[PDB]
């Protein structure tokens, strides 16, 4: 049905561009430096590029028939790595649904607190808004699959116009947009933001919050039967969408670092508008001292800038409330693409009976065999993780499970190309199995640097599932 | 052909009773509580008991003739697990030689600092004494193998005389032995020490310095050709020596906590002997306040007690300088039993050619085919760790590698009894493969709790050495 642009490239660019593009890129260039945000984006692009090569080698190992990213992995490689990846990835998308709707609810709550609508506290309005938007997304996943492929191009032309709106707002200079940060492209602010601050966080804890902005590269491989030719659509879409989103992340990082200060008092200075006595840097005025804390703690007695407000891409963009309100489009599109692909892999795993007490989640109800017990279990896991209503503590879990799945893929293709499996002839031009080994080692090492006990628990679960399906 | 007592039980009780019995047990009951020291000894005894059951299942899987240490593991299980255990264990003993001679050199250096002999600073006299005692132990390992099996019983009666001397000195009460700690058995100091302090260290960092006191349980399974029947000597000796040394460690920990204060200044107090007011503990006098630090750091302005002097088992003992000088016997006997067993496993691994650039170290010289290249490589690996002249930073490495080896054994027997290997008939009464799975998961978790990056490095080395030998 689909080609390669509308089927793989648009779906990967909608699954990748999620929460951290708008509401957490500027906080990453505020915590880490520009030279560290570039290293963060280049590392999370190297990881996803190696995993994209490794899944294109699976998608070019024959097997045109059969939809689902579980099917290509369990047919090309063994059923052990297939079952392990089809459980870890179907848990990673089920918790990524919670991440994207927590980011959406946080955006809605931080829009309504600027207005008069504030019912309960900030960490309890997200638990209310995030609950309603996950039962409205469950209904649109079980009764609105025919409009999703029609509305994906509308969501993409919302999203690309939102990014271009942010950029063409970043080139202009408005003095009313000052006191929230956002002076013009200044080499003083560019030199000040060049270099880390790490207020509260650290490197490989800013990377852990970044890395779910790089996940979603298996949105092309998850639909194989929907495509026309999976030998030419899945590499050419994934390894192009990864490059496009990496360049957009690098450009957004440099644009947010080169024109926004790290802290800014939310009060206009019309008395003494030009202040240069005892000046340090970035002085068009406004006297942005006394917001940087004297103590080295996590506290910062300010309300705007790159460090505090979480939402400064609204005031940098030319028109915030509708055009830069493509935060909603990105979050709901990524949560929709992760809500119809977490039971899909799970239904494909429960049909081929592998795990004992799991085959009850395979009865696909409805007309198109949509798995309702898979949808309800994904909804249960998602609603179990919405209740921790803070994106900065959901994201080191999504990063952990997606690094586990992307280490398992890059290790399974290396083990297949090393053990010389009979049905593993990887007819792809740039595969180079030692690069997939280096990618798997890098994913495991970064997953352990982020959070060592969760990484140890996830690797013990992966080894237990592998030694179970091996000696079944 | 030895029996089962003087070939397995004596060798295991000499390899297990190493450094941490005399010079680092009172510091463990000073850092942790009495209850936490008992939990530490019981956890290490559980780990070594599960590994003793798992190596008894290997030593009772036939294979009487052609005995060895690498031989039983490589011939009952596969060569893939044997060729990795025979490198991790042969590196663990090669670095344990450095640990035992660093403990011996530290004992010699502190005995010379109690006298007037002092050449250079304290962290450089250990680098001098530790280098001389590792080139003298190399000559004994290549020349004096005939005297070793006849002097092991003499070293054992020295060691048991030292333990009984410590105990019968602990029951008596001497007024002159006060101000170094060591009041008599009383419930006040027992209630004071029942509870953690953790000055500088933490739990699973006091356990990491403890756990080399439990290692050495494979000294019975390292000489199988030197035994009459390995089916009855190795299970009945290992799991008896582990119980004996665990009861001795529990008794020494309780007898060190129930009569020694945690802090005691070396100033005798004749004037104002017995205090009346402002007293919390120590109802005999000497006013041991103001040695506890007001700050919460690792610094302590004191010189004796349980926390500081490192040698208080000389003070508690009846006659220190020759009877409680079994520290030298324990350290040199354990370093000798780890110096003749690190190339022995390595020679047995290099004869069956597995690794490409390793086969040079198999040229056994001498009259009894003792590998001088393996001895020189073990001497080099030990000399690369003697230069780090601090036992509290050597011991979390020995603990890491021995937990890796004891996780690999307890996982190899579980993988053999789960895969139902054709040559794995574990004729042993108390094997129960899920207990070996629990004792492998527990070692893999504790090895990561101690030091996560070294555990990740060791697990990546183990997985590399398993995927290299297995799937090639």
From Swiss-Prot, chains A, B:
According to the record, mutating residue 333 to A results in: Severely impairs transporter activity
* Function noted in UniProt: Cation-chloride cotransporter which mediates the electroneutral transport of chloride, potassium and/or sodium ions across the membrane. Plays a vital role in the regulation of ionic balance and cell volume. Important for maintenance of endolymph volume in the otic vesicle, probably by regulating ion homeostasis. Also plays a role in normal development of the swim bladder.
Q: What is this protein called?
A: Solute carrier family 12 member 2
- What result is annotated for mutating residue 425 to A? Severely impairs transporter activity
Q: Which domain of life is it from?
A: Eukaryota
What does the entry list as the binding residues for K(+)?
15-16, 100, 212-213, 215
Q: Which residues lie on this side of the membrane: Extracellular?
A: 30-33, 110-122, 172-202, 258-318
Q: Where does Na(+) bind?
A: 14, 17, 330, 333-334
Q: Quaternary form?
A: Homodimer; adopts a domain-swap conformation at the scissor helices connecting the transmembrane domain and C-terminal domain.
Transmembrane portions of the chain: 4-29, 34-56, 81-109, 123-146, 147-171, 203-222, 234-257, 319-346, 372-390, 391-414, 432-451, 452-467
What is the native source organism of this protein? Danio rerio (Zebrafish)
């Amino acid at each position: 049905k689909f080609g390669w642009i509308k089927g793989v490239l648009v779906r990967c660019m909608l699954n990748i561009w999620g929460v951290m593009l708008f509401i957490r890129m500027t906080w990453i260039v505020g915590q880490a430096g520009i030279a560290y945000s570039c290293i963060i984006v280049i590392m999370a692009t190297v990881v996803t590029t190696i995993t994209g090569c490794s899944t294109s080698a699976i998608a070019t190992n024959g097997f045109v028939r059969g939809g689902g990213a579980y099917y290509l992995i369990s047919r090309s490689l063994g059923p052990e790595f297939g079952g392990s990846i089809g459980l870890i990835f179907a848990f990673a998308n089920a918790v990524a649904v919670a991440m994207y709707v927590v980011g959406f609810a946080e955006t809605v709550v931080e829009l309504l607190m600027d207005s008069g609508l504030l019912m309960i506290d900030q960490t309890n309005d997200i638990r209310v808004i995030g609950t309603i938007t996950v039962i409205l997304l469950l209904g649109i996943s079980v009764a609105g699959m025919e409009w999703e492929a029609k509305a994906q191009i509308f969501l993409l032309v919302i999203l690309i116009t939102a990014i271009f709106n942010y950029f063409i707002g970043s080139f202009i200079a408005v003095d009313s947009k000052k006191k929230f940060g956002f002076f013009s492209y200044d080499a003083g602010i560019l030199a000040e933001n060049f270099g880390p601050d790490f207020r509260g966080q650290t490197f490989f804890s800013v990377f852990s919050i970044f890395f779910p902005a790089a996940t979603g590269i298996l949105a092309g491989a998850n639909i194989s039967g929907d495509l026309a030719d999976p030998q030419m659509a899945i590499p050419k879409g994934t390894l192009l969408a990864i490059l496009i989103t990496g360049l957009v992340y690098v450009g957004v990082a440099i644009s947010a670092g080169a024109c926004i200060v790290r802290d800014a008092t939310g009060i206009e200075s019309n008395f003494t508008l030009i202040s240069n006595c005892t000046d340090a840097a970035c002085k068009y005025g406004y006297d942005f001292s006394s917001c940087r804390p004297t103590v080295e703690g996590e506290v910062s007695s300010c309300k705007f800038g790159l460090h505090n407000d979480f939402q400064v891409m609204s005031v940098v963009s030319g028109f915030s409330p509708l055009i830069s309100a493509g935060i909603f489009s990105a979050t709901l599109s990524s949560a929709l693409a992760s809500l119809v692909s977490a039971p899909k892999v799970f239904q494909a795993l429960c049909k081929d009976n592998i795990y004992p007490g799991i085959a009850i989640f395979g009865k696909g109800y409805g007309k198109n065999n949509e798995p309702l017990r898979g949808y309800f279990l994904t909804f249960g896991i998602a609603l179990a993780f919405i209740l921790i209503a803070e994106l900065n503590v959901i994201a080191p879990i999504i990063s952990n499970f997606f690094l586990a799945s992307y280490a398992l893929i890059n290790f399974s293709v290396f083990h297949a190309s090393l053990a010389n499996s009979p049905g593993w002839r990887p007819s792809f031009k740039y595969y180079n199995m030692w690069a997939s080994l280096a990618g798997a080692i890098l994913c495991c090492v970064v997953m352990f640097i982020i959070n060592w006990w969760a990484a140890l628990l996830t690797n013990v679960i992966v080894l237990s599932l592998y030694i179970y399906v091996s000696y079944k």
